[model samples]
Target chain A: SSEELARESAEAAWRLAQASTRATLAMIRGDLKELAEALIELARAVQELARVAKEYGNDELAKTAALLAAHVAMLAIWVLIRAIKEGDDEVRELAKTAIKLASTAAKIVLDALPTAEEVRQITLLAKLAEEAADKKNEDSALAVGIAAIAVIIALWALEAAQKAGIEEAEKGARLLLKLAMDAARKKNPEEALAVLNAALDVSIALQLLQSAKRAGSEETRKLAEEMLRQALERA
Target chain B: SSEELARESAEAAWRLAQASTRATLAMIRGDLKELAEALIELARAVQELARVAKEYGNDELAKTAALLAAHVAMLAIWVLIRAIKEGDDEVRELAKTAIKLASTAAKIVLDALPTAEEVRQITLLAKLAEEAADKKNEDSALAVGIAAIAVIIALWALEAAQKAGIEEAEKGARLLLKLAMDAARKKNPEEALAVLNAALDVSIALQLLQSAKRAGSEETRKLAEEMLRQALERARK
Candidate 1:
């Protein structure tokens, strides 16, 4: 069995195996392995879910991406646990994968739900980063770029979420709608509408419009109402 | 003896008249009524002591409140007792209710401290004062106007104060200092120093100069050096 081979190889090739297992053990002690494994599983699941969503024309696959993403997260947690027990070299090498996988998983889920196009580009970048990690190249530029993009996305998501607080979904819808309206004003209506539709479903779209009206951002409200009305007309 | 029982029955007519305690002889009921009346007298004595505490916002009111609060709390404790006794609801409604009540009481206590408004005002005023301390470098009339304007702006900001938490306000203030210094130094020194002074406290001014030497907002460092020089020249007492 692979398990028997792993144990035997670990003992026979003690020097190499010890280094890897020691690090894996360290990560477990740090309680990061499960999280790392989960993240990896989450990313893979998201990619699959996205494909399934696009392939079968099941719109709810976009929603189901979150649930399916959970297993990837489990894989990510496992990897992280393995990383913490790793030696310095293993830590340096594997840690990047752990962080990258976690970040990519987060983006995959967050973007899919909100259905952001920017996030699609980001996930592509994430896949590229993952490939680079697998190749084990010391490309600081790629590493730094990956980390930077992840940080920016994380911070933006966090700040926006924090500001929205208990009313996050509606707030997210309004912001997306507002961004869309601004884009439309700039002669980019399609992209603007896409951004809005990405951020919210119909119920949320209406709520965001109402909120925009109360806030006296009339242009935003009007654009959203028009978009929603057009959507209803289409329906 | 029957006459004695009738006399007692007249004194305690309410209980004696009740049929639940009926005896073939009304005289026996009268005897039970007399004992019941005695217990009511004892209750009156306890009530009198409780009244003394309740009337003047004294020990009795606090004791009463504490007792009631404890009873409410005890109801939650009793849930665990019930769980052990019968083991029905894992997450019992009574337990949740008791905890929610306790949390509400704690929130009531927390509400009496420095409100959101006061904290905002204090933060604003403190930052303004710090800016004034920084701009103390300038001797010109324009500098004094700038300083006065900074103070006025801080006061005006009170109207726009948010309902955010203290930590958030602190974070914003820190970010504002960083941003303003960054913005100020976008141009040249004298003007930059003037605006930077308008934005940040003197302490932040010093920190920015030192920090700019490391990373972030390079222009702030130049303005800070000029501001520091001016301050030293004026401080020669």
Candidate 2:
């Protein structure tokens, strides 16, 4: 059995195993207020994007892709916020690309839902760092790219996810959501839109969009009204 | 009510939340072997460090501090492996300090269990980052500090834990341990040495040391023999 072999494996193996476990527990126990708020708005933005996307003619895959890309973009924004805080050279290099990457992706996610063509453009943008420079940063020139896009390049951002944080962050994010919802349910939450049968995890999706609505475009605000309406009835 | 206030904070916030969650799940499902291997050695090193420290004079608080510091140091090495892979000037800058940080902390964690004076020195070393530079290479100048310490600066390393991983990796580390034990218990792995008494989640501590015994110094190897002898008799429960 794998367990048998694992048991015989040395103790550091077990210790790292445990450290990862402790990290998980911390995440689960972490406060979800900050996280819940963020997800709610993003979920709102995703919905608005989904609505606007129909005009462009998307398939289920496109919708799913858009949702994922947006999620990735949101994660990018996650990187951006941290990068900006670090605000140095390599880190800032990551942020500048991240903002445009996020804006391009999120704009499409909310307004167009993306053409693979556009996705390619965004991908190229993320790669543009091939032309990088500083701890203090000369890359501020790239914010120029962000203004041209929209939403301060906070959407459609690049990835800094899997690389750092020991590959545990994604799960931590989800666990936080579940834990938050668990807490929210304590507040009478659970299906304020219990649709379960959607392309993505709609519950989680709605929560993310719900958060995005705040940073979302005008259209996001419009549907955010209804999203909350349904949310009141459901989750 | 806070969640209501929260439910309204905007999407980027939620998005980050979910991303954090997704990262959390990734950790839970991640294979534990590599992590387990590394932890086992450190835990053993910690035991030897702990035993060695007792001769120098210590307390329960010293023991707890040692466990926590070693955990932090283990976490520091976690940063080092990742940093070395990045291995640039800034990152290496972090690594050089980290090795010493990890070494100083771990050595005391295992050996002296730390005198407050040493911890003060460790804190000073981590702060040395105020003088810094990068990319491609250069700070190899300070493997000097690591060598002066012991165990390749792999032990008492500086921290990159809470700051980088957003305060979640530590919990994730513990979660992984529980999950592994759940699996291990399927094979009658529990109670192998279940003495749940005296100091810092002893069960967890023991498992950590048992793993550490491997990379541990000569003394660790000696007691590891006894530790396992009892582990077999007890975890059977």
Candidate 3:
């Protein structure tokens, strides 16, 4: 029943529950090596979930997730160090088991992010900004807060698309080229360059040309490639 | 069958196994309070076991036990501090659990005493040295190493008897009174006083006179009472 409730909570919540249970089972079975590996995976997942949560406007969840992730990471490092410090198999295993325990605790704060729609809107706005920047248009003069919001949304989308690669062509196609151009027109080349750097990361991570071509919008897809080239020139 | 085998193992071994199992089970159940208690108990047990093994001439076992005890103690302290710092109910419970664990471990080591017979022998030797000191006897010139051994064995036995109290009359009956007297005669008043202090500890820990008198040794019983008074007079000065 608890498992069912956890699953119903969110994808991240289900993962957190699953990982904790698996770690406990590993410990019970005396497979601490497996537990250690499981903890490493859980820590990474928590970190990603935390970032995604923050990007989706869940500050409270993000803070908790980050703290939990840090705790889990510390546990992993402590265990790995002990394992290498002495050749005692039992001590090594015990340390690994501790890491598994830490990860299980961290899972309570982890959850899937409701970031899709938010990321989409931000990406769309970033595209609009890029078009306005190209014409050096004063109409694109949005608030400083909007510029910051654009950065946050673009970064999240870039990270997501990077991980998904070409398979997320539709998401990757909207890269931050337009957003960076807007920043440049706003007389903030550093902000523009930072966004471009993130775009570069996305381009490299997703093999932008392939994904951009597959993106639904022809003009958007073409600009995805062209913008990356222009962004590189500004580099 | 494995359970049967486990049951048949030495008590210390069995306790170690049980504690480990309990700790893991507690961890799985999200009962960290229980786990912390278990760890504390294990640490205490290991420390006592280490001392007992050392007294029993099993130096290797003692060394290993001491290291393990240290490790467990560190774990207990770490968990307890974190529990208090975070103000988490579970962490606090975990700390309470660790103390319980330590106590259990201590019980296992406390229950066994190879130190008793060894203490008896060492106390007998210290008596011999005390007699020689009374007469200014030259034969009491044991090498420094032997003297150190006497101190070590006497100190450990005194500590053990101190903990056992009146219920351990037979053991407590052999407190380190003679060891302190011998030290006094050897012109090592500090050593004498320290041994006397330990003897006083035994008297208090085991109610030595009540137990020694019942232990059927008139000389030891009288000496125990006489030495307590003498040691106290010397301490006051």
Candidate 4:
């Protein structure tokens, strides 16, 4: 299976290399269709890598690879998700990627995601942003939103990853709340503090909304409403 | 200065974004010049980031950022290094980057580089490559070279990082020799075994050669020659 996986990857890389060449030509002609064809192969290649590493007995590497596959799958789905949930001229191609890779996107998220160095870095960013915002640093205020967005996306992925899924998502959500609570108490100008407070709230609300979507939790639905209400008020 | 640093990065990011757009356009036009203008700005942006983090008191982040700065400098220099030491038609552009960024390149390498998870992964790759080579899997033989190559580059970097710098470089080189010697005795097919043996030798040879370049140590020079002599014979497989 490892060799089978290896051979498959080698072939995928070959296809990608050729496709890239052709796609470069296509872009030159102001046509974009050829490159759109390659995302599926990339997503599949990474997912295959995750499978091979799992069988190869490198559990951490497999988890990292799985997260990567999920990210590519996210890229595939972000287009369609954005269309329905929030597009460019390439809507058809992006949505098609979503449809094609949907199951793969879902399946890969079930693998245990890391809760180590990466999360710590994000938390550090959150803290750094809050610190900078207190000094009225505009740049860092924008940067913290990325950390906020990452936490939300991870919760979306983790919402499906654990038992009492949304509840567990809330636990992670509440952890961010500690940082939010700390920032609010320390205080910044309205724009800076609001961004931090609102970012934290939106992160929490999404988990509740995702919870409501999955298991029809009315309590969680109300919780989601309260968060958005609080988020908007802070905004 | 945090604000000064912050404003600087924002502009750098702004320049990068616009340059990126133009670079994409140039690729469509088959003209490469516009993109080449961007590497220095990118490298400067990262090195500035490293400086900012150090000032901000995040020591590991600073170290990681410093390594990244050194790597971008490496990218700037690798072309020239490859040309004299080892090219595409774009040799003029690449070598120019080396000249332009040369001092910036040298200065960044002084920071202590990581000796942690990354090196462990390289060692893992070395071990994995050796293990797979023994199984006579041709797929892995080609891959071990990358791991082998990384050790050479790091030793080259570390050769400049320590006290009795060359001596420290040799210490790292010999640590790898333990892995090398283990593989040699376990035995592999001629092609597979030779690649590992030769790779490990070349890594050691480069460190000694770099030492000789700096310190004019005849002892180190002889060590390098012996390594290459053995490397070539193994490659004769």
Candidate 5:
């Protein structure tokens, strides 16, 4: 039963991914109506993914779907805000419909999603974007939209890089641990420190490379600040 | 006894730190002779630190002192390399003298220092500088000197930042750990994830800040490559 549910959830996610690509293309093409329509579909697919994942007790998948649903909802709001800025009544109505669709999807998934710092950050971004939309401030709305997109992209890149980095570091961890234990057993601080230094070498190298990636974007800087804040708490 | 050793180590470090400042100033002024002399004194102080730290059975301190001794030795070699470039006989002789003094200091401390990645890196840097000096290649020696300084500084700054950052984060660790436990007990994924996310936030943030610092220099870039290599290996597992 769980296997079937996993397959079903995967299918829904695959569809949602396709819809997101379409929505992004529509946005890039400056097709506000098409973007709105695509996002609505994207939201619906995400909702289905979340529902299935939750039904199957796949919390990880459910949480991921819920987060994606929230992100799609924000994109829909961006569409609405952009429409209001352009003063196009038809596009505005279309975007409003998309907003309702996406918001409903977000609400459905919210219960399953984890409430993390990232979610909070995005929630604030969404709120600010909404407020700017309400005021019909095109510049503010557009700025928020670009920022939100950049933040999302930067986070995704960092997540992928970190996953790879962690995996790479883990390979040496066991060997280094063994070396350290051996040195300690012999009561040799030189050997123990030597082994530990190798571990640190691994960490420093990984961190420096990751830092290089973050240095390239202002959005990454903001994310880095958020990350530093997180580090402060964890440290 | 440990307290006395710590006080003695601190005094030695303070003295070396001061001498390092003087050597750096002389370096900036392009006075290779003065820099050489100052480094010899710095090497002596570092040697003392390492010996005392070793005697007290404080390997961390001993290793730090030994590494600093190695760094001081490199600095002297840099001076010697530069003297040859200038072809100044008096400065060259002085530089040679400084090198012997630093080399002796390093040799003494090397025994106390642990063999590790950073030490290995410094050793390689030292070897390259020595080779360039032996071959009388001024350019290579100078380049190695600059690179060595940058790497050493980058690591020092990173070490200090990580220490402070960890201390600051410890206050939050307890609270977050408790929250994670509570959320798990209540079977609330959202809440559990939230707390777990908090811990991740701390790690990500610290790492990014450290990375920002590392990106500032070329030597750090080379060091970063090694880090990426480490990451790649662990990633495979």
Candidate 6:
């Protein structure tokens, strides 16, 4: 039963990796991916293959399939090894990868499928042109339709503005971290002080200077304030 | 020799600091346009101001400027402490800062007279009726002529650009550090892995992988791979 269990698990891993790889390769080469995916109808197919491999304790036919399964497992192992090193420990991480490999294998089996029925939809198509074209008002029933289009365009613009705001927030978070590191990079206390005078907000300089005076060296603190005061007077 | 040396050293440092402060403050107040040039002059003036204040035993005045200089110096010290802790301790580091500050201070003070004379010429003329009428053209022959006569007016754009670049770099650096540190805050291996992927570039990733695999714990190695794998397919677009 234990041998049977290992044989089953090994077969599943192999089949998934093979199917995904085959499907992916076909997709990459301009073939129908869905039909390729349909080849992996059941897990029994993988187990049956594993039983054909001679490398393990199975019959010739069983050993043949089993050997193929083992190779598939090897690919799965590669994916797992790579994913592990990436610090990702998600089960889905492996499952998603195994699914990818399986898709590749399934694609190979689907190579004979008819091309006409394939879906060629692209998700990234821009709707801007369509919206712009609809904005032009015409007579009769078209003018009201154009007004409707203008409303839709306004909505799209609003959505774009919201997205822009979100992007700006992300940029702000990134810039703040960069400032501290660049300040540290300046090397000398006086250069850093000079840099901060120009770089930081007056309030931040005041806080950092006061904190330094209370917690850091006397000379450095004195210098920071001296720089700040000089900078302030020039303001 | 020791007493005299200590007093001389203190005085020099004190004077240099006061000058530096005045220069920076002048820039902030919009009196001085160029950071590189203004700070240099201020550093010199501060030295003179401090020496005079100290010689007159104008303790309050001397103390005020001294405190300001000491405050800046203290901020400097804090940054040094942080830098050393962050693994940047070297003699060259300190020497470089001193040179930068010294040069900037010297430049500002040396040109004070000529700059003042130019400022005076512009102020006396003030705004002309033609300037307001030419607002639409924004740039006319007379405006161009006036600008050509003044070095400060001509160099304003260059000065602004230089200052902005320095400010922008600082802000960018701060944000990156925060992202790097976020890994510790999240604590989850997946999150830490995300941090490693999002922040660490190729070199850092490779170093981390080697560090984890060779001597780091099994846990670290696993996490390292997870991070590496996540970024395997970079979004080039």
Candidate 5 chain B weakest ten by summed lDDT: B228-237
Q: Which ranges of candidate 4 are over 4 A from the true structure?
A: A1-42, A48-65, A71-99, A111-235, B1-38, B48-62, B70-99, B102-106, B111-237
Q: Could you tell me the lDDT of residue A231 within candidate 3?
A: 39
Ranking by TM-score: 5, 4, 1, 3, 2, 6
- List model 5 lDDT by residue over B112-201, tens digit each: 554644444444545444555565656555455444443344344334334435443333433443443344334343454344334433
Deviating ranges (above 4 Å) for candidate 5: A1-235, B150-154, B157-207, B210-237
DockQ of 1: 0.01
What pairs collide in candidate 4? none
Q: Which ten-residue region of model 6 chain A has the weakest summed lDDT?
A: A116-125
- Alpha carbon lDDT at A70, candidate 3: 40
Give, for candidate 2 chain A, the lowest lDDT window spanning 10 residues.
A191-200
Best by lDDT: 5
CAPRI rating of model 2 = incorrect
- In candidate 4, what are the lDDT values of residues A1-235, reduced to their tens digit? 4344334333433343333334323322323334444555555555554454444443433444444443443333333333332234464354355233423422433333344433333334333433533333333332333333333344433433342345534444444444443443343333433434444334433432432333333433343445545544543
lDDT of candidate 6 over B38-157, digit per residue (tens): 434433444454454344433333433332332222222222322333444342244224223433322222234224322222222222212312232222212322222121211221
TM-score of chain A of 2: 0.26
Better of 4 and 5 by DockQ: 4
* CAPRI quality level assigned to candidate 1 from its DockQ score: incorrect
- State the displacement of the C-alpha of residue A179, model 1, in Å, after optimal TM-score superposition: 16
lDDT of 3 by residue, A1-235 (tens): 3232212223443355356445533433335577666665565556455544444534334434544454444344333433444344654554444444434333333333334433333333333333432333222322212333334434444544544453343344354535543663464534643553444333422332332332332322333444444434444
Native A-B contacts reproduced, model 2:
0.00
Model 3: CA > 4 A from native: A1-235, B1-9, B88-237
- Candidate 3 or 2, higher lDDT: 3
Q: TM-score: which candidate is best?
A: 5
Give DockQ for candidates 1 onward, in order: 0.01, 0.02, 0.01, 0.03, 0.01, 0.01
Ranking by DockQ: 4, 2, 5, 6, 1, 3
